[PDB]
Amino acid sequence: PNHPLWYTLCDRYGLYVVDEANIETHGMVPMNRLTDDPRWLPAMSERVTRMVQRDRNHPSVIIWSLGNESGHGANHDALYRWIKSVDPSRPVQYEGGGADTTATDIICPMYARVDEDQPFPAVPKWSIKKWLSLPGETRPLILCEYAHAMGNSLGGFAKYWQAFRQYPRLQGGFVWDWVDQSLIKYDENGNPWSAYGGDFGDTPNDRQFCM
Amino acid sequence: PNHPLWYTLCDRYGLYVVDEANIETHGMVPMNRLTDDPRWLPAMSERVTRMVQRDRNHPSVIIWSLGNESGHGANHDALYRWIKSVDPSRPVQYEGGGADTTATDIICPMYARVDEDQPFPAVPKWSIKKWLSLPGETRPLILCEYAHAMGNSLGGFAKYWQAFRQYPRLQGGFVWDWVDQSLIKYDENGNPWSAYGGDFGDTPNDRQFCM
Ligand code: NA
Ligand code: NA
Ligand code: NA
Ligand code: NA
């Protein structure tokens, strides 16, 4: 959840907001080790419930999200239903565990390609066009993340937009991402330069991947 | 409906058969002028009902077809339901009126393209990939006719097969078609040659379009 003023500005300037619980357990092995554990349900529940209680009156918030990259655990299903029960006014989405689980109203993959399948075991990323028409699938598809804009990037962006416009159930996505996470450091003369992972003696680190 | 031996041969050699009623009213304006007329239901009903009564024991017949290019009329809906009631063992398909009407269990367009939409009014031919995922659509798609093999043709054939293999619900199609409808004439020397429309003083005619 963001700084409270963010929602007020989005209400007033006009932007649709996906408000997202502060839950990410990416580093766990496997990713849902905590989120499938009933011992972590209380802690997870507070990150979802207290977000809803705070932000539910904002018109800019149109979709609730259960967090990011925490696999798919039984705790997600429980909290999905909790939101559906207390706030029927907003769809709930969640990407973890293959982007189309029972804890999401919207197929919301990250970095699924337009035409090319990436058939990873258990959590494949289908071509977005193909994904829509998988047997039994009826939901809209909106990428929670696509077109990773790292450095000299955004090649193939037009291919996404051509597809979004042609397919009714392809309703767009959220680019990753808005602003480089570089930090300012100073040289011996006090001149500022843009720093990234590893520049603060921080180790281990993932270098320029924050930008 | 074919010569009865065809079905015996398809049974024994192993070919899947779409058995199709002898109804085509292509030349009407609009195409459903007679098929939507209850006055023509009796004539229509015999062409469907007597086909089903003859061929229903042939294993090679896997799908029934209500005919060809006769628009979509109320008579189709009645006869669709007649077959479903008497023979639940086979899906019923029919292309007329836009290939996805209430008279067909299978989206069965003719000459719909792989990627390109052809948005004709009333009866659009959507890209086959797009068609599958239109809001509320769940049926399988199998083209009753595609890859018009007229003369030096079948360009872009590989594109259909790439799509058929990638998309579960694209389950193939029927090439148009098997054999040139040319007829043998003889010259002044008694030597045989291949003839098409117009070569018999027949007029009006559509020339080589029978090949
Ligand atoms: Na769209
Ligand atoms: Na990053
Ligand atoms: Na297929
Ligand atoms: Na022809």
Side-chain angles (χ1 to χ4, degrees):
Chain A
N2 279 30
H3 184 296
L5 183 63
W6 181 250
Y7 308 92
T8 286
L9 300 170
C10 290
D11 289 353
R12 296 178 185 173
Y13 284 101
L15 288 176
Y16 307 125
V17 177
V18 177
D19 202 9
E20 188 157 278
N22 185 21
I23 305 164
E24 169 157 3
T25 68
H26 204 159
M28 294 308 302
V29 184
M31 212 185 303
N32 78 346
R33 185 174 280 276
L34 307 180
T35 65
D36 204 40
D37 190 341
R39 180 194 292 275
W40 288 79
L41 180 57
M44 281 176 67
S45 80
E46 296 208 343
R47 284 152 190 266
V48 166
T49 66
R50 296 173 75 250
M51 171 187 60
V52 168
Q53 288 181 301
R54 194 190 70 167
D55 296 344
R56 62 176 304 160
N57 292 329
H58 282 293
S60 59
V61 177
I62 65 158
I63 295 155
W64 298 116
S65 173
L66 300 180
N68 194 61
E69 297 183 315
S70 307
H72 176 237
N75 297 354
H76 288 117
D77 292 319
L79 297 176
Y80 165 91
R81 185 59 206 160
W82 185 92
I83 303 182
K84 297 293 275 183
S85 169
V86 321
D87 184 24
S89 82
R90 295 174 176 94
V92 179
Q93 78 173 49
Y94 178 60
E95 183 277 340
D100 63 2
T101 68
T102 50
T104 190
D105 294 329
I106 298 159
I107 306 160
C108 55
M110 51 178 66
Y111 315 104
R113 293 175 189 193
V114 175
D115 301 304
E116 182 181 9
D117 285 345
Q118 302 162 84
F120 307 114
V123 282
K125 300 189 196 295
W126 308 112
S127 150
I128 58 177
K129 293 170 178 178
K130 167 185 176 160
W131 209 320
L132 287 181
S133 59
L134 287 184
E137 189 52 76
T138 58
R139 290 168 286 182
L141 191 155
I142 303 167
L143 300 114
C144 74
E145 293 171 40
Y146 82 113
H148 198 253
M150 183 179 188
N152 196 348
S153 195
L154 235 84
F157 197 66
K159 196 182 279 167
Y160 279 97
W161 284 89
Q162 193 281 322
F164 298 159
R165 288 185 174 103
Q166 182 180 19
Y167 283 63
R169 284 171 54 214
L170 293 178
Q171 291 185 260
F174 301 80
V175 172
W176 187 274
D177 66 350
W178 180 242
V179 58
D180 280 351
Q181 297 186 56
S182 60
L183 291 173
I184 293 159
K185 285 178 73 69
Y186 302 95
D187 74 12
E188 67 177 349
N189 298 310
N191 303 308
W193 53 273
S194 294
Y196 56 75
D199 294 338
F200 294 90
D202 51 318
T203 178
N205 68 84
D206 289 302
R207 307 287 208 216
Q208 69 262 39
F209 202 65
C210 54
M211 303 191 293
Chain B
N2 279 27
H3 186 291
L5 183 68
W6 181 248
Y7 307 90
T8 286
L9 294 176
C10 291
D11 286 345
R12 299 186 178 162
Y13 280 102
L15 288 179
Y16 305 125
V17 181
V18 173
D19 203 11
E20 184 154 283
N22 187 22
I23 305 163
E24 170 158 1
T25 74
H26 201 159
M28 296 306 297
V29 183
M31 208 191 301
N32 79 348
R33 188 168 283 274
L34 311 175
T35 61
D36 198 49
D37 192 337
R39 183 181 186 259
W40 285 82
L41 180 58
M44 282 179 69
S45 74
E46 301 203 343
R47 281 155 190 263
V48 170
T49 64
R50 301 173 75 242
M51 174 189 60
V52 171
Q53 287 177 314
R54 189 191 75 165
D55 298 338
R56 61 176 303 153
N57 294 343
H58 282 292
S60 53
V61 179
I62 65 159
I63 295 157
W64 301 112
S65 169
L66 296 171
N68 192 60
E69 299 179 308
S70 304
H72 177 237
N75 299 356
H76 287 121
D77 294 332
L79 294 172
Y80 166 85
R81 182 56 196 156
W82 184 88
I83 303 171
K84 304 288 281 176
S85 186
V86 303
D87 187 17
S89 74
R90 298 173 174 95
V92 182
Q93 75 168 52
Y94 174 61
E95 181 279 337
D100 65 358
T101 67
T102 51
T104 189
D105 297 323
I106 294 159
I107 312 158
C108 51
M110 54 172 76
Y111 316 103
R113 299 175 183 196
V114 182
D115 295 305
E116 188 189 345
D117 286 351
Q118 291 166 99
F120 310 113
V123 285
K125 301 194 193 295
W126 303 113
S127 154
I128 62 181
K129 295 181 186 176
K130 165 173 172 169
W131 211 323
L132 284 177
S133 58
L134 289 180
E137 190 56 71
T138 58
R139 285 166 293 181
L141 195 157
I142 299 168
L143 297 109
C144 69
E145 302 174 32
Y146 81 114
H148 202 259
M150 177 183 197
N152 198 348
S153 197
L154 233 79
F157 193 69
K159 201 180 283 176
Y160 277 96
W161 286 88
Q162 194 280 330
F164 301 160
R165 292 189 168 94
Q166 183 176 1
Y167 285 57
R169 283 173 55 219
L170 292 181
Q171 297 184 257
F174 297 84
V175 172
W176 189 277
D177 64 357
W178 181 243
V179 59
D180 281 345
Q181 288 188 60
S182 61
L183 297 171
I184 293 162
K185 280 176 81 79
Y186 304 92
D187 64 16
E188 62 285 340
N189 299 308
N191 278 325
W193 58 271
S194 293
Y196 54 78
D199 291 342
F200 294 84
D202 53 309
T203 168
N205 72 81
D206 291 305
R207 302 287 167 92
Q208 70 267 42
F209 201 69
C210 60
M211 306 188 294

